[PDB]
Each structure stands twice: as structure tokens, then as C-alpha cells.
């Protein structure tokens, strides 16, 4: 690529879950969803990657 | 209003006020300042090219 200073940020989209609220197979009891712990994450960098 | 554009080597824009010409050897961060009745609005804009 054409010349540019490298600058990178990490994001993970994470989920943590609980089951057995009244049953299994029916559904998850609860899932906690986050982007690096936030509800919103933006890239303000030249480079980025997401897990 | 007056609008002020300037750059610094570190991201702590408050520590310097420069313009690089020609080739660098490090990233430079560039910011915009503008003030409304002491409301010193200040923001990062971007990183300069290598040259
Ligand atoms: C764009 O707007 C920004 C938004 O606030 C400006 O940031 C401010 O910049 C001034 C200088 O850039 C900071 O100065 C502070 O000064 C105190 C006092 O100590 C200093 O002075 C004594 C006397 O000269 C000397 O002995 C000391 O060594 C110091 O040098 C410091 O204690 C602070 O640590 C600091 O440097 C402002 O706080 C600062 N804003 C922020 C958020 O920090 C920025 O200047 C504007 N950009 C331009 C180019 O005008
Ligand atoms: C993306 O998620 C991971 C998990 O939420 C958070 O980063 C993880 O940070 C550790 C510590 O910096 C990385 O290294 C690990 O260290 C332990 C202890 O020495 C070792 O057992 C593990 O093998 C490993 O080295 C872990 O690699 C890293 N995980 C990943 C997937 O990169 C990472 O902080 C997240 N992103 C953000 C923005 O937080
Ligand atoms: C989702 O997050 C909540 C909030 O972080 C978790 O429930 C908390 O669990 C701790 C430890 O048992 C309690 O002290 C808090 O009071 C609980 N918070 C609330 C609001 O009740 C929940 O367990 C997480 N759920 C999942 C699936 O990870
Ligand atoms: C950013 O540029 C400034 C210009 O002031 C650097 O500060 C000088 O660094 C040399 C080299 O590090 C010292 O010999 C000077 O005495 C320094 N300036 C002052 C006021 O002491 C600063 O190192 C630069 N780089 C970064 C990352 O801040
Ligand atoms: C957003 O994420 C950072 C992640 O390190 C965390 O400290 C912060 O408290 C989260 N934001 C909110 C509003 O909780």
C-alpha cells in the first residue's frame, strides 16, 4: 500500500451467557453483550481488527 | 470565529504547536482549536502523511 503510519485498535464483540432459567433447549436465560465492555465503540485509527 | 490548526508529535496536543514540512520520522497528530467566549473547543482531526 501507499505510505502511511501504522496505527491500530482492537475490538471484541463479546457475549456471556446463562442457561437453566426454567429450562434448557427452550432458550438462554440471559446473555450479556458488549463491545470492549461498552454499548458503542468506534474506530478513530488508521487500522483496526475485530474478534 | 477564528479557527486554529496545528500539530504535535505525541497525542497530547496541549504540549506543542508545530507544522512539519517534508519527511518525518515519527507520526504527527493534528488538531483544530476554536474558541467561543472562552469555550475552547478542541479536537483531534488526524495523522499526517510521512511527507
Ligand atoms: C487548544 O485548546 C486546548 C483546550 O483547553 C488547549 O489546551 C490547554 O493548553 C494550555 C497550553 O497548551 C495548558 O496549559 C496548562 O498550564 C498549566 C500551568 O503550568 C504551566 O505554566 C507555568 C507558567 O508558564 C510553568 O511553570 C509550568 O511548567 C507549565 O508549563 C499546567 O500545569 C497544565 O499542566 C498545562 O500545561 C492547558 O490545560 C490545556 N488544556 C488542556 C485540556 O490540558 C490547547 O492549547 C489549545 N491549543 C493551542 C495550540 O492553542
Ligand atoms: C479482546 O478480548 C481479550 C479478552 O476479552 C482481551 O485481551 C486479552 O489480553 C490478555 C492480556 O493483555 C492477552 O494475553 C493473555 O495473557 C494471559 C496472562 O499472561 C495468558 O494466559 C493468555 O495466554 C494470554 O496471553 C489475551 O491474548 C488478549 N486476548 C486476545 C484475544 O487478544 C483484549 O483486551 C480484547 N480487546 C480489547 C479492546 O480489550
Ligand atoms: C450480566 O450483567 C449483570 C450485570 O453486570 C450480571 O448480574 C449481576 O451479578 C452480580 C454477581 O452475581 C450481582 O452482584 C449483580 O447485582 C447482578 N446484577 C444485576 C443487575 O442483577 C449477570 O449475571 C450478567 N449476566 C450474564 C449472563 O453474564
Ligand atoms: C516532540 O517535539 C518536542 C519539541 O519541544 C520534543 O521536546 C524536545 O526533545 C528533545 C528531543 O526529545 C529535547 O532535547 C528538548 O529539550 C525537548 N523539548 C523540551 C521543551 O524540553 C519532544 O520530545 C517530542 N517528542 C515527543 C514524543 O514529545
Ligand atoms: C466503556 O469501556 C471502558 C472499557 O475499558 C469502560 O471503562 C467504561 O466504563 C465503559 N463505559 C461505560 C459507560 O461504562
Curated annotation (Swiss-Prot), chain A:
<feature type="disulfide bond">
    <location>
        <begin position="23"/>
        <end position="26"/>
    </location>
</feature>
<protein>
    <recommendedName>
        <fullName>Spike glycoprotein</fullName>
    </recommendedName>
</protein>
<comment type="function">
    <text>S1 region attaches the virion to the cell membrane by interacting with host ACE2, initiating the infection. Binding to the receptor probably induces conformational changes in the S glycoprotein unmasking the fusion peptide and activating membranes fusion. S2 region belongs to the class I viral fusion protein. Under the current model, the protein has at least 3 conformational states: pre-fusion native state, pre-hairpin intermediate state, and post-fusion hairpin state.</text>
</comment>
<comment type="subunit">
    <text>Homotrimer. During virus morphogenesis, found in a complex with M proteins. Interacts with host ACE2.</text>
</comment>
<comment type="similarity">
    <text>Belongs to the alphacoronaviruses spike protein family.</text>
</comment>
<feature type="glycosylation site" description="N-linked (GlcNAc) asparagine; by host">
    <location>
        <position position="32"/>
    </location>
</feature>
<feature type="glycosylation site" description="N-linked (GlcNAc...) asparagine; by host">
    <location>
        <position position="12"/>
    </location>
</feature>
<feature type="glycosylation site" description="N-linked (GlcNAc...) asparagine; by host">
    <location>
        <position position="38"/>
    </location>
</feature>
Amino acid at each position: 500500500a501507499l505510505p502511511i503510519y501504522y496505527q491500530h485498535t482492537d475490538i471484541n464483540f463479546t457475549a456471556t451467557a446463562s442457561f437453566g432459567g426454567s429450562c434448557y433447549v427452550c432458550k438462554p436465560h440471559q446473555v450479556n453483550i458488549s463491545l470492549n465492555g461498552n454499548t458503542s465503540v468506534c474506530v478513530r485509527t488508521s487500522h483496526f481488527s475485530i474478534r | 470565529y477564528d479557527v486554529l490548526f496545528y500539530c504535535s508529535n505525541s497525542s497530547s496536543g496541549v504540549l506543542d504547536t508545530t507544522i512539519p514540512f517534508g519527511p518525518s520520522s515519527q507520526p504527527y497528530y493534528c488538531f483544530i482549536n476554536s474558541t467561543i467566549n472562552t469555550t475552547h473547543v478542541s479536537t483531534f482531526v488526524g495523522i499526517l502523511p510521512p511527507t
